[PDB]
Design a protein around this nucleic acid. Structure first.
Ligand SMILES: C[S@@+](CC[C@H](N)C(=O)[O-])C[C@H]1O[C@@H](n2cnc3c(N)ncnc32)[C@H](O)[C@@H]1O
Ligand SMILES: [Mg+2]
Ligand SMILES: [Mg+2]
Ligand SMILES: [Mg+2]
Ligand SMILES: [Mg+2]
Ligand SMILES: [Mg+2]
Length: 333
RNA sequence: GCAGGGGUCGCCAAGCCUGGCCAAAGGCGCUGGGCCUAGGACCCAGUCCCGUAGGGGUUCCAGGGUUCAAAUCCCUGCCCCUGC
C-alpha cells in the first residue's frame, strides 16, 4: 500500500530508522524495482519523515504488493488472551511438556471436550510437533504412569527424545518419563568416573543410566516390562550394549553392589533406603530423591540408618503448593 | 556417496526454499515472586553482554565471499546421525 520509494543504497540504514520510529508497516514485504526499494510504511507525513530520514524519497502509492503476511502467534500468545480467566482459575495451563515430537498439555476435565479439542488444535497448529495429548490422570501405579487423552496430530505415543547429546525411545503412555529432569540427569552425568559401577534402581527407559555411560558398569533395574523393552532399545541406540545391564525385576530381590546408586522414585523411595545401603559399597554414594515440605525427615530418617554424610542437598521442583521434590546425595562410610 | 540428512543464545526446538520489525518463536532448565492443592503441579517476571530504559556491543559449528542488508544465498576447514 502506502510505500516509501527509496534508493537501495540507503535500504538498510533506512529500514533501521523506520523500524526505530516504528513506521515500517510489518504486514507487507519490501519489494524492489531497479535501484529502488519499496518499504511498506504506516501513515505519517513527508516532513516528519524528512526529519528522521536524511534522504530523498517518494511516498509512491504502490499496490498492496499482495496481502497481509501474518506473524504466526505463539500458543501462549493466543491462549493467554482467549482464556486468561480459567488459566487463572487453574483449568487451562500455558506450560506444557514436549517429549520427542509429542506434546502433552494440561487441561482440566471440567473444561468441555469441544474446547479441549480446539485448544489441542491450536497447539498442533502453533507448536512444532506431530501429535498432541493432555494429562488424563495423575502419575499413579507402581509403574508410575499416567493416562493421556489424544487431542490432535498423530495418535502416537512412541517417539525419540533428545537431551544432553543422547537419544531415547519413550512411549509416554506406557512408562514414566519427564523431559523436565534433563538438567538433573546432566549434573549426575558430570560425576560418573569411568571406573564406577552404577546402580539405577528404577531405571525406566533408561535416561539416568545412559547419562552415566562413562562408568565401568551400569545396572539398570525396573519391574515394568514396557520400560525394559525400551531401555534395551536405548542401550543399543546409544551403542552402550556392554556397559548397561538391563534387569526386568523387582529391585528388592536383586544382588548387585555399586559405588553409584540412583533412587528415582521420589514417592516411595523411603521404602527402599535399606536395599540401597545394601547395594551401596563402603565408600559408595547414593543419589536419593523424595518429597517433603523440607529436607528434615529426609536427613533425619537417613541418620538412623548409617554412617552417612550429606554430600549435596537441593530442590528439584514444586510438587504442589508447598510440597517439593528433593534430591540428596549421600556419602557412605 | 546418485530418494541424500545435519550442526541455532545451558538442554530441546522454530526460522533457512522465498534475504529485510531476527538478539533470533516456543517448551524445558536456571533466578526471583506467587500459589495449602491441575498434585512428579500451576500463575507472574527475568534469563547473550553493558545500561534503569531509549540504546550500544557481540552471536546462529569456524573462515572467506556475494548483498544497502545474511542464521537464511555461494565455493569452503572440523564434526555427526537416516542412506531409488
Ligand atoms: C520415576 S520412574 C523412572 C523415571 C526416569 N528417571 C525419568 O524421569 O526419565 C520409576 C520406575 O521405577 C520402577 N519401579 C517401581 N518400583 C519398582 C520395584 N520395586 N522394582 C523395580 N522397579 C520398580 C517403575 O516401573 C518405573 O518404571
Ligand atoms: Mg488453585
Ligand atoms: Mg516457589
Ligand atoms: Mg519477516
Ligand atoms: Mg541478522
Ligand atoms: Mg539488563
Amino acid at each position: 500500500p502506502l510505500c516509501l520509494k527509496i534508493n537501495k543504497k540507503h535500504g538498510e540504514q533506512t529500514r533501521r530508522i523506520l523500524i526505530e520510529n516504528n513506521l515500517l508497516n510489518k504486514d507487507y514485504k519490501i519489494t524492489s524495482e531497479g535501484n529502488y526499494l519499496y518499504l511498506p510504511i504506516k501513515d505519517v507525513d513527508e516532513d516528519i519523515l524528512k526529519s528522521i530520514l536524511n534522504i530523498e524519497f517518494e511516498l509512491v502509492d504502490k499496490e498492496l504488493e499482495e496481502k497481509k503476511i501474518i506473524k504466526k502467534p505463539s500458543f501462549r500468545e493466543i491462549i493467554s488472551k482467549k482464556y486468561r480467566k480459567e488459566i487463572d482459575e487453574g483449568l487451562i495451563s500455558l506450560s506444557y511438556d514436549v517429549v520427542g515430537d509429542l506434546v502433552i498439555l494440561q487441561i482440566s476435565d471440567e473444561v468441555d471436550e469441544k474446547i479441549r479439542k480446539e485448544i489441542g488444535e491450536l497447539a498442533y497448529k502453533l507448536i512444532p510437533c506431530k501429535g498432541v495429548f493432555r494429562r488424563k490422570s495423575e502419575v499413579k501405579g507402581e509403574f508410575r504412569v499416567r493416562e493421556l487423552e489424544h487431542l490432535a496430530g498423530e495418535n502416537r505415543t512412541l517417539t525419540i527424545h533428545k537431551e544432553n547429546g543422547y537419544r531415547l525411545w519413550v512411549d509416554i503412555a506406557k512408562v514414566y518419563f519427564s523431559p523436565r529432569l534433563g538438567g538433573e540427569r546432566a549434573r549426575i552425568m558430570k560425576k560418573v568416573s569411568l571406573n564406577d559401577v552404577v546402580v539405577d534402581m528404577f531405571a525406566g527407559v533408561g535416561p539416568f543410566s545412559i547419562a552415566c555411560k562413562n562408568a565401568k558398569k551400569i545396572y539398570a533395574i525396573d519391574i515394568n516390562p514396557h520400560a525394559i523393552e525400551l531401555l534395551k532399545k536405548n542401550i543399543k541406540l546409544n551403542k552402550l550394549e556392554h556397559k548397561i545391564i538391563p534387569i526386568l525385576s523387582d529391585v528388592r530381590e536383586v544382588d548387585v553392589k555399586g559405588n553409584r546408586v540412583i533412587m528415582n522414585l521420589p514417592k516411595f523411595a523411603h521404602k527402599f533406603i535399606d536395599k540401597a545401603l545394601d547395594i551401596v559399597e563402603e565408600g559408595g554414594v547414593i543419589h536419593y530423591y523424595t518429597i517433603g515440605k523440607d529436607f528434615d525427615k529426609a536427613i533425619k530418617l537417613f541418620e538412623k540408618k548409617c554412617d552417612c554424610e550429606v554430600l549435596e542437598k537441593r530442590i528439584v521442583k514444586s510438587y504442589a503448593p508447598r510440597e517439593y521434590i528433593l534430591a540428596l546425595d549421600f556419602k557412605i562410610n
